[PDB]
Amino acid sequence: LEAKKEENLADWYSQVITKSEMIEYHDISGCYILRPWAYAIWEAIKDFFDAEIKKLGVENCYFPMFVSQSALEKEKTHVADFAPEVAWVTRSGKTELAEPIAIRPTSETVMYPAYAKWVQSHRDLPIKLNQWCNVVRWEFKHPQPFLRTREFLWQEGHSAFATMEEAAEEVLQILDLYAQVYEELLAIPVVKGRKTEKEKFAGGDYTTTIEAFISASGRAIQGGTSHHLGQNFSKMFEIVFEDPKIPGEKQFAYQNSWGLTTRTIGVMTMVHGDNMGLVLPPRVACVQVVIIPCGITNALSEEDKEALIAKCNDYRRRLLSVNIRVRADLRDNYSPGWKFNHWELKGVPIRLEVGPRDMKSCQFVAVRRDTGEKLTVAENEAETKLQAILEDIQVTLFTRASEDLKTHMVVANTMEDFQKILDSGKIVQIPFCGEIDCEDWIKKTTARDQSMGAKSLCIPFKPLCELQPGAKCVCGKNPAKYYTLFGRSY
Amino acid sequence: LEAKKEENLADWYSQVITKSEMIEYHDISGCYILRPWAYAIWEAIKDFFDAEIKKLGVENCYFPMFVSQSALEKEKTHVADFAPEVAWVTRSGKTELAEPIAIRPTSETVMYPAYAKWVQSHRDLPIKLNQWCNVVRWEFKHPQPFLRTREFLWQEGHSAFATMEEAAEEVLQILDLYAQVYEELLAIPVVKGRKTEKEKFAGGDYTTTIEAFISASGRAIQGGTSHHLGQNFSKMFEIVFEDPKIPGEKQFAYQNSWGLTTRTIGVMTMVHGDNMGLVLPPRVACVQVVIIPCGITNALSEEDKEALIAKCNDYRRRLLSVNIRVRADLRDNYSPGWKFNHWELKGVPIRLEVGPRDMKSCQFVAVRRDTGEKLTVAENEAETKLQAILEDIQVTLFTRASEDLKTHMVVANTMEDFQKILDSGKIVQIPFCGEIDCEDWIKKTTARDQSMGAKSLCIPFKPLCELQPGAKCVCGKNPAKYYTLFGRSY
Ligand SMILES: Nc1ncnc2c1ncn2[C@@H]1O[C@H](CO)[C@@H](O)[C@H]1O
Ligand SMILES: Nc1ncnc2c1ncn2[C@@H]1O[C@H](CO)[C@@H](O)[C@H]1O
Ligand code: PRO
Ligand code: PRO
Ligand SMILES: [Zn+2]
Numbered sequence A, B: 001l002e003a004k005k006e007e008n009l010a011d012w013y014s015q016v017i018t019k020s021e022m023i024e025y026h027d028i029s030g031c032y033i034l035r036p037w038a039y040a041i042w043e044a045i046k047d048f049f050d051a052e053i054k055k056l057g058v059e060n061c062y063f064p065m066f067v068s069q070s071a072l073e074k075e076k077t078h079v080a081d082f083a084p085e086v087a088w089v090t091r092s093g094k095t096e097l098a099e100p101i102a103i104r105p106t107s108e109t110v111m112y113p114a115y116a117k118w119v120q121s122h123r124d125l126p127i128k129l130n131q132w133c134n135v136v137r138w139e140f141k142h143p144q145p146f147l148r149t150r151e152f153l154w155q156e157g158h159s160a161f162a163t164m165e166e167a168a169e170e171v172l173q174i175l176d177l178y179a180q181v182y183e184e185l186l187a188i189p190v191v192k193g194r195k196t197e198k199e200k201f202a203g204g205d206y207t208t209t210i211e212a213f214i215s216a217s218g219r220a221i222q223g224g225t226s227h228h229l230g231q232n233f234s235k236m237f238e239i240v241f242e243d244p245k246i247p248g249e250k251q252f253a254y255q256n257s258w259g260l261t262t263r264t265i266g267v268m269t270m271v272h273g274d275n276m277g278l279v280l281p282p283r284v285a286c287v288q289v290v291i292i293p294c295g296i297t298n299a300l301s302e303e304d305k306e307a308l309i310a311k312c313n314d315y316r317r318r319l320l321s322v323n324i325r326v327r328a329d330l331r332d333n334y335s336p337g338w339k340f341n342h343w344e345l346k347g348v349p350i351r352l353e354v355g356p357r358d359m360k361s362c363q364f365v366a367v368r369r370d371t372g373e374k375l376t377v378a379e380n381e382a383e384t385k386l387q388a389i390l391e392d393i394q395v396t397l398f399t400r401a402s403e404d405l406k407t408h409m410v411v412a413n414t415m416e417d418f419q420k421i422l423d424s425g426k427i428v429q430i431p432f433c434g435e436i437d438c439e440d441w442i443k444k445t446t447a448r449d450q451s452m453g454a455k456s457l458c459i460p461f462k463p464l465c466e467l468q469p470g471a472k473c474v475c476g477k478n479p480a481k482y483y484t485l486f487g488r489s490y
C-alpha cells in the first residue's frame, strides 16, 4: 500500500478498495464494479437483515425499475426533491418511444399505486414488502466508491398499516436492525436520532437515522434511514379503506419506508482500514482464516512438501467443521511472503501459518490482522483458540471505534466553542432552536469562520447533556429546543 | 377461476397469475410486479443454482447496469443483434448528458473490459463470475408475464479459461444444472441440445440449450442457455495472456457465458396449472402445507374454538420440525370454504384439514392439490405421511409432464408428415441439412401450409431416431446432417 490514511485519504481509499480487490472502476462516471470480495460482505449483511425483517412479517418481492412520469409526480413534495437526479430513458434503439420513462431513484411511486389496488379492506392491512435492488441517482458531484455513487445496491422496505401506532413501532424496530448491522456486524458505533425538519425525507412526517463517524476525514456519514411517511403518500395514491368500527368514513393508511445501502462497506473501510490495507470484521469477511504453508526452503523435500499440504488441509477441514470461513492458500506460483501480504491487503482477520519447524512440535502460528499480534497455538486447541481470537477481533475493532467516537463527539454550548471544536475535526452536540432558517445559517457561518459547512446530523434520542431550562440556541435569537448533533459530512 | 386452460389460454394465464397473487400489472407496458408468492419461487431456484455454481468455483459479484456506447460496440456481431432492443438513457432531470448511455440487455460488454484488466498472467485464469440482476430488452411485440417481458430478473455467469477444453467442460456442466432446475425443482422435462447456426448466440461459436414443451398452446419454449463464446470477445476486448510454455506469442482466453431467467416461473405455470388455478411443485412452493381449521359451526363453543387452534399449532410446530414449509391459516374473518379456495388458487401442494370431529378420533385430513385426493391420516404419523405425499406430488407432476412431452415430440421424416404433425399441435424431430437458408424456408413454408411458422428448437444431443445413411433433409435439395428438433415457439 502506497499512500497513508493520515496524508492523502482519497488516495489511500482509492488504493485500499482496489488492492484489496473490492472495487474496479467502470468507464461510466460514478459507477463501480463490486468484485466478489466486496459483494460477499453485502451478502453477509443481506443474510442478517433479511432473516430479521422476515421475523417481523416482511416479505420479499420485486417491482419494476421503470416508473411513468404520471406516477412519479403524484406526491409533489417527494418528486420535487428527487426530480433533477432522475435519469430518463428516451429511445429504444433508434425508436424514440411515446414517452420518457424514469429509472427508479427510489420506489415509493412504483409500489404505491399497486398498494391502492391491493388494499380494499381493513383485512388487507398491514402490507409489508421489501426488495433488494439497484437504484440510480444521477449526481455529478465528484463520486466516491460505496460512499457516493450514481448507481448502487440497497434494500427498501415499504409498509402500510391501519393505525399509526403500528407504523410508529415498525420505524424504530427497523432502525434498531440498522443499528445492529453497523454495530454487531461491521463493528461500527452509531448515534440513533431524528433528522431535523430541514434534513428529513421529502414527503412524510419524520425521518429517523443512524449516523457514524469517519475520524480520518473528520466528517460523519449517514448509515441508514427509517421514515414515517404518514398519510402523505396514502392520500396522493388513494391507498384507502373503510374503518369497520367507524363506518361510512374513508380512512388513509399510515405508511413507512426504510433503506440501507452498500455505503455500509465504505463506512466499514474508512473506519477500520490500515496503512497495511483493508481490515474486515470477522462477522462479515468472505474468509475469516487463511491457512498458509510457509517456511518452505525452495528445493528441500517432496515428501515433506506433501506432509505440509496434508497438514494445511487437516486444519481447513477442522475449521470448516466449526463454521469458520477458512481458505487454504496452497498455490505454488507465489511466495509465502507474497501470500502474507496479499491476504493482509484483503483484510483477512487471522492468518494461519504452517511451517515444517512448527509441525515438528505438533503446533502452529495464528496472526491477528488488527494488532499484528502472533500467537503460537497447540494443534489440538485449534478450533477453540481461533473462535476466541476471531470474536476478540470483533470486540477490539468495535471498542477502538467506540472510543474514537466518544472523543470526537462532544457537547459545545456556544457558537464560539462549537466553531473551534468543529474545526479540530469533530462533531458536536449543540443546543438548537430547530428552525430551518437558523440551520441554513450555521451552514453558511461555519464555512466562513474556518472547506465545507457543518450540517445537522440528527437529534440524538439519547443526547450527551440534559438541556437546561434557561438555554439559548447558538444563534442567540430563539431559546434551544433540543441538543442537536452537528458536524461536517458526506 | 373464470377461464378454462383449454379455451382462452391467454385469459386463463392472465387470471391464474393474478388470482394466485403472483403477478401485478404495471403502468408501463411489458413490465410486471413480482409479488412475494412469485418471488419466493425465484428465491428457491436461486438457492439451488447458487449453491451448485459455487461448488464449480464460480463467485458472485455485481457490475454496473449502464454500458457506454464505445464498449457496447466492440464486438460488432454481438451488438448487431441486440442494438434495436437496447434502451438509452438520455437526460438527467432536464440536463441532457454528454452521452447516451445504455442499459444492459446483457453484460458481456460491461464485464469484458474489466476481464482484460484482470488477466495479466496465465495465473489469473480462470475467471468465473456470476451475477443475479435485472436486464432490459425493449421489444414492442405483445408481452406476456414471465414468458416475454421488457424487464426481467436473471442470473448470468461469465467465465474465461486458458484452454478450450476447460471452457468446453463448463458449458455442459451449467446446462446440466439448468436441466436440473427444470426437472428436479419445477418438475418440467426438457430436451438438451445444440442451437442451430441460425439460432445461436450472436457472437461466439456454439449455443447449447434446454427446451420445454407447453402442450396447452402447442408451442415449445427455451428454458436456459449455455454459450461457448470462444475467442470472439477475447479478441475484441484484449483479454490476453502470455502462454508460459509457448513464450513470445500472445494468447486469447476462451470464454463462456450462460443465463437463466424468471421465465422459469411462467413455464412452471403453463405446464402444471389447472382450471382450479396454479399448482406448485413441492420443491419450490413458499408454503408446502397449509393447515386449515374447518368444520367450525359458527357459534358453537369457545373452549373448543381454543382446542382447535391449539391442534392446528401442534401440527405446524411438528411440521416445521421436519423442514416442511408450513403455514397455519387461523384467520377468523374468512370462511373455511373461502380458505380452501384461496390456497387452491395459489397452488399449495397439501391442504391440511383439522376439524373437531376428526380431532375426536385423534386424527386429520390431508388433501393433494394435484389429484384432489383426500387421505385421512393418524395424528402420530403426520410428519412421515406428509413428507411422503409431498415427494409423491413432486414425482406425479413430473411424470405427467414427461408423458405429455413424449407424445407431443415425434420423429417425422418428410415435409408432408412434418406439416401434419406440426399442425396437430406438436413438435417434431426432422432430418435436416443444417443450412440457414433451408431453415428460413421451413419457417415461411410451415406458415403457408397451415398462425406462425415452425422454428429450430435445438439439435438434440440424444435424438429420437438414428439418422440413416441414405437420408434427405425435408427440403429435398441436400442430404440430412442430423435429426433436428423443430416446432412452433414462444
Ligand atoms: N450515494 C449513495 N451511495 C450509497 N447510498 C446512498 C447514497 N446516497 C444515499 N444513500 C443512502 O440513501 C439512503 C436514503 O436516501 C440512506 O440510507 C443513505 O445511506
Ligand atoms: N422475454 C424474456 N423474458 C424472460 N427471459 C427471457 C426472455 N427472453 C429471453 N429470455 C431468456 O434469455 C436467455 C438468453 O437470451 C434465455 O435463457 C431465455 O430464457
Ligand atoms: O430513499 C429513502 O430514504 C426511502 C427508503 C426506502 C425507499 N425510499
Ligand atoms: O444473453 C445470453 O444468452 C448470455 C447469457 C449470459 C449473458 N449473455
Ligand atoms: Zn437557532
Ligand SMILES: [Zn+2]
Residues within 6 Å of the ligand: B432, B433, B434, B435, B438, B439, B473, B474, B475, B476, B477, B478
Ligand atoms: Zn434442408
